[PDB]
Tab-separated table of C-alpha atoms and ligand atoms in Angstrom:
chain	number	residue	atom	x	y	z
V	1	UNK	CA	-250.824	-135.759	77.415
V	2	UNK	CA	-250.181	-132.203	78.008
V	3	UNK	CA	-248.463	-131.428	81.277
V	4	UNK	CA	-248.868	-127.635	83.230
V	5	UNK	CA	-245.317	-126.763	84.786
V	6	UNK	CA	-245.663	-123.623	87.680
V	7	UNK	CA	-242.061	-122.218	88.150
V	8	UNK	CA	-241.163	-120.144	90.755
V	9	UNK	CA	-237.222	-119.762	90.242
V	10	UNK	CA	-237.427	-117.101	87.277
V	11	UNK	CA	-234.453	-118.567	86.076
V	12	UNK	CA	-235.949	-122.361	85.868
V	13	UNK	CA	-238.590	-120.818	83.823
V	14	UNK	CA	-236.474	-119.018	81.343
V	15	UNK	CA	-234.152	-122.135	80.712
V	16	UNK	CA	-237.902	-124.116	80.297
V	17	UNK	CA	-239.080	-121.658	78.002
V	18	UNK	CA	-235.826	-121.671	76.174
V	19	UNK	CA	-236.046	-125.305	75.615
V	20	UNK	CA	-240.232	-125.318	74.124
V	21	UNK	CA	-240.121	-125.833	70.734
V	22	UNK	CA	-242.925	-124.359	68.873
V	23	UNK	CA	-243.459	-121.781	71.646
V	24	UNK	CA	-246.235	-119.154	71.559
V	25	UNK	CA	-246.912	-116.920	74.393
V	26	UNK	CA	-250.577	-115.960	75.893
V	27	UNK	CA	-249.998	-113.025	77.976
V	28	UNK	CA	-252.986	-111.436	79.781
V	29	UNK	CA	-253.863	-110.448	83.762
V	30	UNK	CA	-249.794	-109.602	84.400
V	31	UNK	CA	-249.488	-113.271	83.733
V	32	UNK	CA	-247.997	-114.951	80.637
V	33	UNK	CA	-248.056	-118.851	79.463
V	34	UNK	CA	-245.639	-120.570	77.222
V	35	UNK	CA	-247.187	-123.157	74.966
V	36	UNK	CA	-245.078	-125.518	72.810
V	37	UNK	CA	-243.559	-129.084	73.223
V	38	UNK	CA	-240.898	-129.617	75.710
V	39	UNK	CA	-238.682	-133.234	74.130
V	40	UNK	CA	-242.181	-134.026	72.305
V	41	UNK	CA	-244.558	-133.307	75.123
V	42	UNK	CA	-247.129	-130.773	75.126
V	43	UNK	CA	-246.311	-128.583	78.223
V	44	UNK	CA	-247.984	-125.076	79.330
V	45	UNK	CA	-245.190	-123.377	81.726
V	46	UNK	CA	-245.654	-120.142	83.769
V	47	UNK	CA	-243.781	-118.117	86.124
V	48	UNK	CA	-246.024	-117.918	89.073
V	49	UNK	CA	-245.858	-114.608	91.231
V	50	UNK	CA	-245.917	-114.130	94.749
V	51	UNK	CA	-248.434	-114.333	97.212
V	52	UNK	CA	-251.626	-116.862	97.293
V	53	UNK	CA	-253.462	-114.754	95.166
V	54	UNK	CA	-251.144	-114.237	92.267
V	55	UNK	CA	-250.366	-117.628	92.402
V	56	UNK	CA	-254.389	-118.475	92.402
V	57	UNK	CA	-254.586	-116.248	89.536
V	58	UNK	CA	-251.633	-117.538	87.421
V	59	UNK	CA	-252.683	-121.437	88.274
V	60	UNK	CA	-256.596	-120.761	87.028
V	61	UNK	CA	-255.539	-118.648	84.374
V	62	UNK	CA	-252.965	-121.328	83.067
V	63	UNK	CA	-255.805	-124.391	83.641
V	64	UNK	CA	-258.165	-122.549	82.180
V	65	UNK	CA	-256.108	-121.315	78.716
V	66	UNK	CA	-254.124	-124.721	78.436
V	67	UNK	CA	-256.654	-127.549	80.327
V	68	UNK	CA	-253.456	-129.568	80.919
V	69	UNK	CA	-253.807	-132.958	82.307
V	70	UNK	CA	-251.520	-132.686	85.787
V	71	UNK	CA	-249.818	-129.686	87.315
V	72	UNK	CA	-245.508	-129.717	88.425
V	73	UNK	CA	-245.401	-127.164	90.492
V	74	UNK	CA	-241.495	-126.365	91.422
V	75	UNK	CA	-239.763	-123.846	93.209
V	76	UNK	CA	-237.419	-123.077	96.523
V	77	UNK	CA	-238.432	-123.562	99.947
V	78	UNK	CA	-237.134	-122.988	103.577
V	79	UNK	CA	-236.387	-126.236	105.520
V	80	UNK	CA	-237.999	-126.789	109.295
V	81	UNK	CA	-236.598	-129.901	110.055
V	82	UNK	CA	-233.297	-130.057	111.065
V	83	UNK	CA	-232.583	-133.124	109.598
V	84	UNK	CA	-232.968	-131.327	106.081
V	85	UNK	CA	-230.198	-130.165	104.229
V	86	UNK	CA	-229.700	-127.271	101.911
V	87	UNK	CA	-230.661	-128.363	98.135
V	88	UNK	CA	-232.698	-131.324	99.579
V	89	UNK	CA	-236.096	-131.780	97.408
V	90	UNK	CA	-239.153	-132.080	99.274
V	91	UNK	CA	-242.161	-133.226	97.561
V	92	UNK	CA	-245.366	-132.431	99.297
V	93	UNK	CA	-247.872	-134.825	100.447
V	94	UNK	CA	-249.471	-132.943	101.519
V	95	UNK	CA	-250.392	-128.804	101.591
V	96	UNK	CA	-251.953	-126.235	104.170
V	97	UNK	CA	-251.827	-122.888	104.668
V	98	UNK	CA	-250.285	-121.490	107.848
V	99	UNK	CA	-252.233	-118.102	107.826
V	100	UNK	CA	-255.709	-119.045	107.548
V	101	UNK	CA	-257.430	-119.142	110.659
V	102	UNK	CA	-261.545	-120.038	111.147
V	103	UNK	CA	-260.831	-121.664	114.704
V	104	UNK	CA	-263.529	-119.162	115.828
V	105	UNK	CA	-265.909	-121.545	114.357
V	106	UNK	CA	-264.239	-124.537	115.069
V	107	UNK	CA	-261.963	-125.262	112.292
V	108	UNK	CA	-258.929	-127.024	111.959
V	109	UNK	CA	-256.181	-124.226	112.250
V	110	UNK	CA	-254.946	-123.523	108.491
V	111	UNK	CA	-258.526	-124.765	107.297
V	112	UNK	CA	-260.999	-122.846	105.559
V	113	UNK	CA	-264.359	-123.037	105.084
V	114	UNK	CA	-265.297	-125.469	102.260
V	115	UNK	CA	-261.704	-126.921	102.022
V	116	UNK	CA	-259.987	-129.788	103.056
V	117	UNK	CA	-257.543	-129.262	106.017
V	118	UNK	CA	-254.776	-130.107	103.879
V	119	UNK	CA	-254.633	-130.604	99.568
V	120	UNK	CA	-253.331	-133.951	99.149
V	121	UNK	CA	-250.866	-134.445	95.773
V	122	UNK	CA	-251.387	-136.984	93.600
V	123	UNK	CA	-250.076	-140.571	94.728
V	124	UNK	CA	-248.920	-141.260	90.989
V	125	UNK	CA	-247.159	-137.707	90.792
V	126	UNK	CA	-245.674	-138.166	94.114
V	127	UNK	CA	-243.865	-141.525	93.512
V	128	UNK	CA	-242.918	-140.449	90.286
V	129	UNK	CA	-241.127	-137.189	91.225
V	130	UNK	CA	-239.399	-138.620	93.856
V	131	UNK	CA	-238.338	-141.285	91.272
V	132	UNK	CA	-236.783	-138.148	89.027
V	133	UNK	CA	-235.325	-136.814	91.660
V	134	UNK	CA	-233.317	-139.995	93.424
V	135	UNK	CA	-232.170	-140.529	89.194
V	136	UNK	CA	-230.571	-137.114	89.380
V	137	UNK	CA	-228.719	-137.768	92.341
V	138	UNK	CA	-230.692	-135.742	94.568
V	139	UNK	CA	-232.490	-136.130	97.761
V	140	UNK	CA	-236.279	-136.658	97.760
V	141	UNK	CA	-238.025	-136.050	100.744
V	142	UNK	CA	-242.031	-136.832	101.324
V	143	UNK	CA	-243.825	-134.127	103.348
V	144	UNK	CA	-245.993	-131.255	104.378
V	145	UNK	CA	-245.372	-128.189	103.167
V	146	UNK	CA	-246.999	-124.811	104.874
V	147	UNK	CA	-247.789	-121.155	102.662
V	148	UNK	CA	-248.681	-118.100	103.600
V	149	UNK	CA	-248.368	-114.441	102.488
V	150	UNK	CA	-246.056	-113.419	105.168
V	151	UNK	CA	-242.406	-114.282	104.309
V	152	UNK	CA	-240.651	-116.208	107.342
V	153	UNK	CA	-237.109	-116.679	108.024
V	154	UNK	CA	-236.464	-116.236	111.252
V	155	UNK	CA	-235.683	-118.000	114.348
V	156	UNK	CA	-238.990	-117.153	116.296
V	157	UNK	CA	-241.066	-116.934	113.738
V	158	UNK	CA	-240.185	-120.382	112.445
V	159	UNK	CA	-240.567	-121.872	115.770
V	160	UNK	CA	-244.247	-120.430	115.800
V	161	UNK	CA	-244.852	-121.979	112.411
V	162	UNK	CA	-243.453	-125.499	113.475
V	163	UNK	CA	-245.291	-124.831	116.809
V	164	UNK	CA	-248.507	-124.658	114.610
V	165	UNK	CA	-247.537	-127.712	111.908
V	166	UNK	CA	-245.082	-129.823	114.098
V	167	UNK	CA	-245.424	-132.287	110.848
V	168	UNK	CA	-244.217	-129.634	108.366
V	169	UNK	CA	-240.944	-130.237	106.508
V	170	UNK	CA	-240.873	-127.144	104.806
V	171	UNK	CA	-242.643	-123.072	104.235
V	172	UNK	CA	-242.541	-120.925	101.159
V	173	UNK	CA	-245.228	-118.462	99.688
V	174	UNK	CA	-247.123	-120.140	97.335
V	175	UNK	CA	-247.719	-123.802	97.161
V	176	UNK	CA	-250.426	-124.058	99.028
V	177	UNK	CA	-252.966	-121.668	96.888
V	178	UNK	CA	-251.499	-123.885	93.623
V	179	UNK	CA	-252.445	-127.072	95.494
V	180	UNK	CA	-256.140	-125.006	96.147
V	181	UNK	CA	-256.831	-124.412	92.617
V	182	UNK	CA	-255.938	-127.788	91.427
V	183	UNK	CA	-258.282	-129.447	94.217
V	184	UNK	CA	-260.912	-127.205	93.579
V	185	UNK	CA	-260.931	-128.304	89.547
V	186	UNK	CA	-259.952	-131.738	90.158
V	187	UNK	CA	-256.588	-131.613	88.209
V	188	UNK	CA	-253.963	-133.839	90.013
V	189	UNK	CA	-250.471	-131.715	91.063
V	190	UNK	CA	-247.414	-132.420	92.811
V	191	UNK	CA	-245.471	-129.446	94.636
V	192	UNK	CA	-241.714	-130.009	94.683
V	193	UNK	CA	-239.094	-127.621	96.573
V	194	UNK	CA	-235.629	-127.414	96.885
V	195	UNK	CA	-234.606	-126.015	100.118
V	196	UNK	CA	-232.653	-123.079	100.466
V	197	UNK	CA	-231.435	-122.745	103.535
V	198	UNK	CA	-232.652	-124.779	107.018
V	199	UNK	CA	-234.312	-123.074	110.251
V	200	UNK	CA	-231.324	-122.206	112.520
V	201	UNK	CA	-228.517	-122.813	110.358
V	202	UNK	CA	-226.532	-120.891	107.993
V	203	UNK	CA	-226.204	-121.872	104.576
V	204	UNK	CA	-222.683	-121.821	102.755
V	205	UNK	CA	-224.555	-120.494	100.092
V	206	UNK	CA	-225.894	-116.800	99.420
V	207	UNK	CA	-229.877	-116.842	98.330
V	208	UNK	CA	-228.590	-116.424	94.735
V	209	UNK	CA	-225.833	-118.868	94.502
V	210	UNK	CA	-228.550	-121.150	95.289
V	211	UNK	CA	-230.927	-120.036	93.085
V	212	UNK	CA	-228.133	-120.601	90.092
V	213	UNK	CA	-227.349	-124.399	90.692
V	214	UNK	CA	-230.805	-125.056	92.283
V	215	UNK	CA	-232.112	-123.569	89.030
V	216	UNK	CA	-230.941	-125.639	86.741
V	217	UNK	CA	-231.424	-128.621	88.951
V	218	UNK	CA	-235.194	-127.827	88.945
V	219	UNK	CA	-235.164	-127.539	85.050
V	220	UNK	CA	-233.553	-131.161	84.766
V	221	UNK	CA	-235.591	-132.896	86.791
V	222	UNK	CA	-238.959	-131.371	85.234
V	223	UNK	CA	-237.635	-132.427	81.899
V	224	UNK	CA	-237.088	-135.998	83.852
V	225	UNK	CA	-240.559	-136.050	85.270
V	226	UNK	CA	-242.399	-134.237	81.736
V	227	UNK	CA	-240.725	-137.400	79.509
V	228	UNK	CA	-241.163	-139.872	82.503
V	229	UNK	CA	-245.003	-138.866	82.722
V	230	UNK	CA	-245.885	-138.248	78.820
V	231	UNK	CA	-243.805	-141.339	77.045
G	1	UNK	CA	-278.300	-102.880	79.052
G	2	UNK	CA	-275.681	-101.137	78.048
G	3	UNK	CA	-273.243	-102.428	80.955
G	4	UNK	CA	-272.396	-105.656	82.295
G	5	UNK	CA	-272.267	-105.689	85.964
G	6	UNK	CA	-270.049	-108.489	87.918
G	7	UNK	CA	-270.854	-109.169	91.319
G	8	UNK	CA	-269.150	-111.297	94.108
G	9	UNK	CA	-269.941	-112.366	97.110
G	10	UNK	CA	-268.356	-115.551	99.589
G	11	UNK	CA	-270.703	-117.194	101.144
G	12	UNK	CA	-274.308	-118.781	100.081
G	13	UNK	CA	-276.193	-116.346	102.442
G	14	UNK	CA	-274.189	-113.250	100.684
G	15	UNK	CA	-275.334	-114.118	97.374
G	16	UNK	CA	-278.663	-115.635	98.046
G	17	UNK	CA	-280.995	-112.514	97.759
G	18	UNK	CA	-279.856	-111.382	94.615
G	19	UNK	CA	-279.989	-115.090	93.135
G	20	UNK	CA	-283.437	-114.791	93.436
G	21	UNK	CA	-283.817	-111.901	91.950
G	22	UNK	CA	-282.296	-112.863	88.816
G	23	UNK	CA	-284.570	-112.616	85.631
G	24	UNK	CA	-283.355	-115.502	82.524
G	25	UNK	CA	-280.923	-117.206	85.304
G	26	UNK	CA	-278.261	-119.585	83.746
G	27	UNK	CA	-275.398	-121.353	86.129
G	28	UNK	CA	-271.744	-122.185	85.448
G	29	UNK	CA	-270.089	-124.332	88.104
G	30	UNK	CA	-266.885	-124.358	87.583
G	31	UNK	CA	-263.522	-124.787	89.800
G	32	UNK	CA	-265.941	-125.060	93.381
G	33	UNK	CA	-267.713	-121.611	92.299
G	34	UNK	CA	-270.753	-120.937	91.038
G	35	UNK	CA	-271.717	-118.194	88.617
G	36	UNK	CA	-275.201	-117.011	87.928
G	37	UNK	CA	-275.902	-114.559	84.784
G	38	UNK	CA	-279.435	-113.275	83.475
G	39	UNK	CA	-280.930	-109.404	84.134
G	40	UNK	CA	-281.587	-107.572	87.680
G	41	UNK	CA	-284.020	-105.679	87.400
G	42	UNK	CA	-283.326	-105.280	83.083
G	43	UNK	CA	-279.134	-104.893	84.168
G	44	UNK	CA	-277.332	-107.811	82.799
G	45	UNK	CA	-275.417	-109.096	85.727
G	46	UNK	CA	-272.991	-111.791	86.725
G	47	UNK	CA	-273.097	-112.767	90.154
G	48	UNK	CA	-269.720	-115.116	91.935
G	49	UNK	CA	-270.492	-117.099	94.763
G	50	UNK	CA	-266.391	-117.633	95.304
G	51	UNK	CA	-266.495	-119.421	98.963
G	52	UNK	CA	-264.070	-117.693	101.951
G	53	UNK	CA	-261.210	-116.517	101.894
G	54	UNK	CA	-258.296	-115.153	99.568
G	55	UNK	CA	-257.743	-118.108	96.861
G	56	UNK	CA	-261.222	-118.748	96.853
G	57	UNK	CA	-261.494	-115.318	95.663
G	58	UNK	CA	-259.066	-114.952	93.372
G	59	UNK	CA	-259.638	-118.307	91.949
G	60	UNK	CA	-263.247	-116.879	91.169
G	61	UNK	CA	-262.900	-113.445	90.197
G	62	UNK	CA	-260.263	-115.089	87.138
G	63	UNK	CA	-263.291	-117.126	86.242
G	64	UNK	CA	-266.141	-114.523	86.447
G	65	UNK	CA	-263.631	-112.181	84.254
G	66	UNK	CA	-262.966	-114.991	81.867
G	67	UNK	CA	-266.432	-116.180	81.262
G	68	UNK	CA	-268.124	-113.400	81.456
G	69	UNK	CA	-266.535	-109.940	80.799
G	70	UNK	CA	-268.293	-107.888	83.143
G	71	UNK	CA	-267.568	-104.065	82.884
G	72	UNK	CA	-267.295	-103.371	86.361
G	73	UNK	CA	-266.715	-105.877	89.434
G	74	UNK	CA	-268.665	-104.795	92.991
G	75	UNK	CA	-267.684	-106.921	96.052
G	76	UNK	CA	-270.372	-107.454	98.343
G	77	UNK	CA	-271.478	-109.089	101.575
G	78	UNK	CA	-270.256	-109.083	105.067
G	79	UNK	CA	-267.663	-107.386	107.311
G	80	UNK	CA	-265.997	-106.933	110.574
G	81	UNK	CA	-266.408	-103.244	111.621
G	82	UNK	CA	-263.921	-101.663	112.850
G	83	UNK	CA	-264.702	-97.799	112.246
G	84	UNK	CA	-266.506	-96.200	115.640
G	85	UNK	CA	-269.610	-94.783	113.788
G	86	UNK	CA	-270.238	-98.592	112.080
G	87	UNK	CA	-273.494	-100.241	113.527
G	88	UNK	CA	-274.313	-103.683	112.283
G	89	UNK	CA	-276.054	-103.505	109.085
G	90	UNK	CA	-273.971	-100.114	108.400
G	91	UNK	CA	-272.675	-99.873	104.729
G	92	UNK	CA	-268.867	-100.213	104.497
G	93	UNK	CA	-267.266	-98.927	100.754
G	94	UNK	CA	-263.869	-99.305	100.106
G	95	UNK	CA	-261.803	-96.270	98.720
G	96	UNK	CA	-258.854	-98.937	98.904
G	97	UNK	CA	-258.029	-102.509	99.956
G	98	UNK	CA	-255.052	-103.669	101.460
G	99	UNK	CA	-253.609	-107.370	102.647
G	100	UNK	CA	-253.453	-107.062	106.329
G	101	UNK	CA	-251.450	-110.566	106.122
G	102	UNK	CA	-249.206	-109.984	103.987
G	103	UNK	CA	-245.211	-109.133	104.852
G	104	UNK	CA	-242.472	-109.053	102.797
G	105	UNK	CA	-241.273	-106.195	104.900
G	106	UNK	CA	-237.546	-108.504	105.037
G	107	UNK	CA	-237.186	-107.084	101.156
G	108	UNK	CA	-238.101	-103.737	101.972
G	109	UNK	CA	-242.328	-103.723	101.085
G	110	UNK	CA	-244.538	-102.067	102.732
G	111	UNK	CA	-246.124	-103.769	105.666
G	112	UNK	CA	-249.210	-105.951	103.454
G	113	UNK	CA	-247.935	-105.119	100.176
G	114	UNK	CA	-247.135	-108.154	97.708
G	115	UNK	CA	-244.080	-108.094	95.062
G	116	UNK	CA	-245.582	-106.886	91.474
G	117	UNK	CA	-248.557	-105.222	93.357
G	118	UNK	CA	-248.799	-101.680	94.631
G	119	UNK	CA	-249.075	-101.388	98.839
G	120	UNK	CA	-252.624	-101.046	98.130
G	121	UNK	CA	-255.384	-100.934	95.567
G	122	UNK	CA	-257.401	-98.233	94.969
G	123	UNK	CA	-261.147	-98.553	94.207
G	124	UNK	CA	-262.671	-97.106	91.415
G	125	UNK	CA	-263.491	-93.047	92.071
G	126	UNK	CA	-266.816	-93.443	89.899
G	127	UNK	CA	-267.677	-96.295	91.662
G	128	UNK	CA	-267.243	-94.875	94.717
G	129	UNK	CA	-269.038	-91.823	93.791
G	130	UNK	CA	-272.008	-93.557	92.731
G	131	UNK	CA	-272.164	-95.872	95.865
G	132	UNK	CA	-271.993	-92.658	97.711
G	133	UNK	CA	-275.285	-91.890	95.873
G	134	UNK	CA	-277.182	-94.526	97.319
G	135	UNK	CA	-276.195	-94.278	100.226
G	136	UNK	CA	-277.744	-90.851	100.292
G	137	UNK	CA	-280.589	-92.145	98.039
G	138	UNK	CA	-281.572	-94.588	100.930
G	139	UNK	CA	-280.914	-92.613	103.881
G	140	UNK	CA	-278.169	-95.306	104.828
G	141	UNK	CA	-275.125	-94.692	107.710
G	142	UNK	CA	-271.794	-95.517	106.030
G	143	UNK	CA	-267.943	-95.163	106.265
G	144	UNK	CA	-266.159	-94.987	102.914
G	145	UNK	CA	-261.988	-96.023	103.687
G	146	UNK	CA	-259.581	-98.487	103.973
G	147	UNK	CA	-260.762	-102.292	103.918
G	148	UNK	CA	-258.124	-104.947	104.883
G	149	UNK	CA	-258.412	-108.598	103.899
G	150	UNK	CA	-256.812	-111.603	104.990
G	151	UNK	CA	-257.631	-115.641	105.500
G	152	UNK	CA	-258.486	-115.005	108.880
G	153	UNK	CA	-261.453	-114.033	110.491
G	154	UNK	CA	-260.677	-111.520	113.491
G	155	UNK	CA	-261.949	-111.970	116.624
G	156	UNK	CA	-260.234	-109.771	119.255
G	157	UNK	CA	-256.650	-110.081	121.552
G	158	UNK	CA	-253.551	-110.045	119.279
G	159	UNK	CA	-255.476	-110.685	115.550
G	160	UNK	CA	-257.149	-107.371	116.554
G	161	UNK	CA	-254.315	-105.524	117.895
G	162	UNK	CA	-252.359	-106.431	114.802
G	163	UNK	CA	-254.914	-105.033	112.598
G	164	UNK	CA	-255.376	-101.783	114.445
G	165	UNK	CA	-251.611	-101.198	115.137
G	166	UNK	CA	-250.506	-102.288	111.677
G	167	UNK	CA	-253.511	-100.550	109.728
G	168	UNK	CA	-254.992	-97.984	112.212
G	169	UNK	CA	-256.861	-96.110	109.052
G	170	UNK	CA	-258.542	-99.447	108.145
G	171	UNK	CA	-262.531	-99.183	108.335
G	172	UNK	CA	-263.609	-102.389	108.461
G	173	UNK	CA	-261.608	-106.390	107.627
G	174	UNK	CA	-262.896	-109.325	105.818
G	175	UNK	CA	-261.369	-112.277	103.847
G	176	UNK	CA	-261.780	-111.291	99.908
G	177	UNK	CA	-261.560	-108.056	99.218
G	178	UNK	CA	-258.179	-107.327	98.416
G	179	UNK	CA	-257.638	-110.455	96.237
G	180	UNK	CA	-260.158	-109.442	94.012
G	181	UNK	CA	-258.956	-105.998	93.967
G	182	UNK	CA	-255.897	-107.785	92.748
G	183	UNK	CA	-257.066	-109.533	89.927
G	184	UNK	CA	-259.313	-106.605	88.506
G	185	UNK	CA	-256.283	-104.755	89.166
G	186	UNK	CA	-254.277	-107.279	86.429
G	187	UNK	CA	-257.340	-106.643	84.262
G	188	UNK	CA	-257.450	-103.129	84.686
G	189	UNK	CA	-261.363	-103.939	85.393
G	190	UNK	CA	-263.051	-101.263	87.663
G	191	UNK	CA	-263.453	-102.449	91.259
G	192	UNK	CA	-265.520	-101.585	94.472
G	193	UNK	CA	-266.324	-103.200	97.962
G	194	UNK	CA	-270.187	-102.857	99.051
G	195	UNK	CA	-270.527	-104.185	101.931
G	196	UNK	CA	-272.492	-104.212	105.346
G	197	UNK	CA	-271.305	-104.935	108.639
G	198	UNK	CA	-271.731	-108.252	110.649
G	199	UNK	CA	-269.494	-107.287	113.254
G	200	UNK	CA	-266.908	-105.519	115.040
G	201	UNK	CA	-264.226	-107.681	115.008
G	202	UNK	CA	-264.387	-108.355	118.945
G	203	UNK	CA	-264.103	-111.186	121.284
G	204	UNK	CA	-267.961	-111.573	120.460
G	205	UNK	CA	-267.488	-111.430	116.483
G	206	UNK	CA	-267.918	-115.267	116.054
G	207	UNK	CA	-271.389	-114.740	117.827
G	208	UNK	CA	-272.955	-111.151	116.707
G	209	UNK	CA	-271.903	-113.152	112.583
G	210	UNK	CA	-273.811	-116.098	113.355
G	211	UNK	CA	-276.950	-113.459	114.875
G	212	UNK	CA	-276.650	-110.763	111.810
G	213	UNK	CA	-275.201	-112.306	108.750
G	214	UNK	CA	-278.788	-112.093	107.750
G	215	UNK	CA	-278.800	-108.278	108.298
G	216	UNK	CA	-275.582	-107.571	106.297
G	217	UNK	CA	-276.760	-109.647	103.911
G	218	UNK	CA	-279.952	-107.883	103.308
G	219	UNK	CA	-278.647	-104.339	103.812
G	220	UNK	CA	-275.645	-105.281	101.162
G	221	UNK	CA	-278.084	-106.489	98.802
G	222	UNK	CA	-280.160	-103.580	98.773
G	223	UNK	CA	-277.273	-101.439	98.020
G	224	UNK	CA	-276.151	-103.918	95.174
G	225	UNK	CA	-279.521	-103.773	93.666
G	226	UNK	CA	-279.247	-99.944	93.617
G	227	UNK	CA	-276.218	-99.746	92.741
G	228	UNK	CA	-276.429	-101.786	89.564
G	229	UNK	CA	-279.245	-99.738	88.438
G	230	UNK	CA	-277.053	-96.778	88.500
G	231	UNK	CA	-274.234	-98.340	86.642
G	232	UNK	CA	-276.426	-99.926	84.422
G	233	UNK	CA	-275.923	-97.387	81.469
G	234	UNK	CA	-272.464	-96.513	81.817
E	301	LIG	N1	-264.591	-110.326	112.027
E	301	LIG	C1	-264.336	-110.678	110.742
E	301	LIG	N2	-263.099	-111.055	110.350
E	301	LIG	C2	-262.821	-111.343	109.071
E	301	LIG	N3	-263.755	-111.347	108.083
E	301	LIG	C3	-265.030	-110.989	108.371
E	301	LIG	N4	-266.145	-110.871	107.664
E	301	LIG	C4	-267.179	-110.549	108.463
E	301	LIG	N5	-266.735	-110.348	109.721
E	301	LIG	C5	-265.411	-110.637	109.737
C-alpha cells in the first residue's frame, strides 16, 4: 500500500520528511516529492502551495510520479461555525469551491461544468481519520469544507461565504482543487484541517503559535492514520 | 517537424475543429482530459481538451507537459471581450495573464497575485510576435493585452465591475488562462493565449456564448492552424 500525504503546514512536512526512511526527492515544476517509507509504509509526501492551481499541479504531479493508492490531505483551516473551537479537526465530507460560479447557465453555485457540486471523501478514509484523531485526544468533526483563491478572514466576508454554504464548517485555500484531482482520477482522499482561529472570535493564539503545536499534531496523527491504513 | 506544438482548449466545441484535422490521431484519457497527438498539417501537435475552469486546467496542462513534452503551449478557444474595438469572432492574444480571483492582498500581494507566483505571467514575446503575424497574414481585427482568468464566468453588475475596477487594462476574461500560464511558468515552457471572442462579458454574455461559441471557435482555430505552421520549425 503506498499512501500520498499533501501538507500544507511547512512545518508538518519537514518533521514528515524528517521521519522517511530511505528518502529520495523528485523535484520538478517548483514542486518536490519525498519518497521513502514512513514506520514501514510506502508514503509520497509534498508540500502543496497556494492557490487551486498550485495545489492542482502539486496533487497531479505527485499521483502521477508516485500512483499512490489514497491521498491525506492535511493542513489549517478557518472555522465558520461557532460551535468550533480553535485546534478542532474537521474532516471533510464533503468539498466545493466557493469562487466558482456557472449560475449563468444554471449551475449549482460553486459547481462547474463537468463536476460534481461537491467531491465527496472516501467513507473508509473518513471513519478512519476521525478514528486517529479521537485516539490522539483531539476533536474530530465531519463536514463541508469551502476553497477558493481569495483568502477570507473577516467578519463580512465570512458571513457572505456562510451566506453562500450555510452547511460549511470550515474555508481555507486549497482543499477543494486536491479533492478535484483525486475525483477526476478516481483515487480516494480525505481532507483534514485543524482550525486556526473561528469566525468572530479571537484566538488566544497568534497564527504561528498555532502553526507550532498544530504542526506537530498534524504529523502524529498522519503517522496514526499511514500505520492504521497500511498494517 | 522540428517542434512539438501543445495546444489547449476547455470545452469539446473549442477543440473539435482541430481534432479533425489531425493526421495519425492517437488518444490518452487520462484524469477526465483527453489528449489527442498525430501531425497538423505535417506539425506534430498535442492538443488538451482540459474541461472549464482553473483546476481543470491546471490538472491538464501537468498532464499534456508530462506525456508529451511539447515545445511550446498555445491556449485557445473562447473569451469574454472586454476591450472596445473587440467584435465577436475578434482575435484576443495575451501579452500577460493574471488571476482576477485571486487575493491575498491581507499579506501584502498584489490584488490576483498567488504566493510563489509573480502578480502576473508574461506570455512568450516570440509567441506573441508570431501571432501578431497572422493576424496580419489573415487580415484579422485583434487586441494583444492583459487576459484575466478566474472560475467564474462574467456576466455583468458587480462580477463586471470587479473586473473592470480591479483590472481596468484587462482585454478580455475567461476561466483557464492564467492557470496554465502557471504551470508552463513552473516548466519554464513558452506560453500564449489565442483566442476569439464569444462575448462581452454583459448582462447578455450567457446568451451571445450559447449564439457564437461556434464563431470563436472557428476564428480561434484558424489562427491555431496558422500559427502552428509558423512555429513549426523553431
Ligand atoms: N463572459 C465570460 N466569462 C468568463 N469566461 C468566458 N469565456 C468566454 N466568455 C466568458
Amino acid at each position: 500500500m503506498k499512501i500520498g500525504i499533501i501538507g500544507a503546514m511547512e512545518e508538518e512536512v519537514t518533521l514528515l520528511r524528517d521521519k522517511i526512511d530511505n528518502r529520495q526527492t523528485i523535484t520538478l515544476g517548483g514542486c518536490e516529492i519525498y519518497t521513502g517509507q514512513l514506520n514501514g509504509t510506502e508514503v509520497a509526501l509534498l508540500k502543496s502551495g497556494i492557490g487551486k492551481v498550485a495545489a492542482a499541479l502539486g496533487a497531479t504531479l505527485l499521483l502521477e510520479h508516485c500512483k499512490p493508492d489514497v491521498i491525506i490531505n492535511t493542513g489549517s483551516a478557518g472555522g465558520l461555525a461557532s460551535t468550533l473551537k480553535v485546534g478542532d479537526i474537521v474532516v471533510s465530507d464533503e468539498t466545493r469551491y466557493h469562487d466558482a460560479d456557472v449560475t449563468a447557465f444554471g449551475y449549482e453555485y460553486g459547481q462547474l461544468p463537468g463536476c460534481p457540486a461537491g467531491f465527496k471523501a472516501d467513507d473508509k478514509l473518513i471513519a478512519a481519520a476521525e478514528s486517529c484523531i479521537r485516539e490522539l485526544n483531539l476533536n474530530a468533526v465531519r463536514g463541508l469544507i469551502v476553497s477558493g483563491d481569495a483568502f477570507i478572514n473577516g467578519s463580512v466576508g465570512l458571513a457572505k461565504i456562510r451566506h453562500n454554504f450555510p452547511d460549511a464548517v470550515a474555508v481555507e485555500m486549497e482543499a477543494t482543487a486536491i479533492a478535484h484531482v483525486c475525483h477526476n482520477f478516481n483515487v480516494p482522499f480525505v481532507v483534514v484541517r485543524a482550525i486556526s482561529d473561528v469566525a468572530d472570535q479571537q484566538s488566544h493564539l497568534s497564527f504561528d503559535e498555532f502553526l507550532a503545536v498544530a504542526a506537530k499534531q498534524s504529523t502524529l496523527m498522519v503517522e496514526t492514520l499511514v500505520q492504521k491504513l497500511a498494517h
